[PDB]
Write a protein that binds this ligand. Structure first.
Ligand SMILES: Cc1nc2ccc(-c3cc(N)nc(N)c3)nc2n1CCOc1ccccn1
Length: 336
């Protein structure tokens, strides 16, 4: 009764898994911490709900994780490792390496004042390497759900991170789900109902990295129209050649007689298009977010200008010219 598996702390599965406790949850089902008695090690077991839509999503996840594990490259280690999968009490069970807390928990630890530019840079470099791996031709995987909750520290003391949750993922050219990406991290092409490729993940990364340094979401929309309005506050009206091709352009925008585009007024205010400058959100010249980094080492105007320049390349409206992972890794923000 119910789609979830019932789990009692202390119980043992197939004389092997000491279900320690419950460490996670989602629309997919539950994640449990269990000791693998046979392998003398902690594992995270993702227990998929007994519902066809979530079972179908998890079989795509198993297939893409096994595709990735076939690759001889050190880059694959920014992706969470699937150890095994089996059916148990009519639930699909995915056994993962045990990781530490997600990047939202890390922000909550700072009272949402943000982590340092130095740590932000370390997360940025690993995430760009993970996106480079996903962009390998034979993979061409779109994650489609990048958010701080889906980026996990390997260890609570170190900077090493891994991407989890390929449940909403697809490969280049697929259209499977009605709505994709977590709203705050959703690319303009997805809001506009346009075709989407690996560039949507780069957009999400841009939003994530600003949130990690400032402590608060760059674009916190309560709905799709509010999301697009928040993006326009910072980046201005999207290019006419994009909006001219966009199925949902008229959800947000209106074409003038002279051929130019403006915001549709809401059925009711926002800052004028492009007036909420990322320069001021980052506090490039005013001591960083809320002035809290003033004088601190690793928070110079020069460091901030490189960060801002890389972020604005990740948040390019045009998915064709948006910076790609290979080029992102060559940016002066990452220079030793
Ligand atoms: C502590 C820990 N280790 C994990 C290893 C893997 C996974 C894991 C792996 C895959 N493919 N999808 C999910 N959804 C979680 N989740 C782990 N968690 C804690 C739980 O985090 C989260 C994060 C996001 C959503 C739910 N729960």
């Amino acid at each position: 009764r119910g789609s979830h598996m019932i789990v009692k702390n202390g119980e043992k599965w197939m004389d092997r898994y000491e279900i320690d406790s419950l460490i996670g949850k989602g629309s997919f089902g539950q994640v449990v911490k269990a000791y693998d008695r046979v392998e003398q090690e902690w594992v995270a077991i993702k227990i998929i709900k007994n519902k066809k839509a979530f079972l179908n999503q998890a079989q795509i996840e198993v297939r893409l994780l096994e595709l990735m594990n076939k690759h001889d490259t050190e880059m694959k280690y920014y992706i969470v490792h699937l150890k095994r999968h089996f059916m148990f009490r009519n639930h699909l069970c995915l056994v993962f390496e045990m990781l530490s807390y997600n990047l939202y928990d890390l922000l909550r630890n700072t009272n949402f004042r943000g982590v340092s530019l130095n740590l932000t840079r370390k997360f940025a470099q690993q995430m760009c390497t993970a996106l480079l791996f996903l962009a390998t031709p034979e993979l061409s995987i779109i994650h489609c759900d990048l958010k701080p909750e889906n980026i996990l520290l390997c260890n609570p003391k170190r900077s090493a991170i891994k991407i989890v949750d390929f449940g909403s993922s697809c490969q280049l050219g697929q259209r499977i789900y009605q709505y994709i990406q977590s709203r705050f991290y959703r690319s303009p092409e997805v809001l506009l109902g346009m075709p989407y490729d690996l560039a949507i993940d780069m957009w999400s990364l841009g939003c994530i990295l600003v949130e990690m340094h400032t402590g608060e979401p760059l674009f916190s929309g309560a709905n799709e129209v509010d999301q697009m309005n928040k993006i326009v506050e910072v980046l201005g009206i999207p290019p006419a050649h994009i909006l001219d091709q966009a199925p949902k352009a008229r959800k947000f925008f209106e074409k003038l007689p002279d051929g130019t585009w403006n915001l549709k007024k809401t059925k009711d205010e926002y800052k004028p298009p492009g007036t909420r400058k990322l320069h001021n959100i980052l506090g490039v010249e005013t001591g960083g977010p809320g002035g809290r980094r003033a004088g601190e080492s690793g928070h110079t105007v020069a460091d901030y200008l490189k960060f801002k320049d890389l972020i604005l390349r990740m948040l390019d409206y045009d998915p064709k010219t948006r910076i790609q992972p290979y080029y992102a890794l060559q940016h002066s923000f990452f220079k030793k």
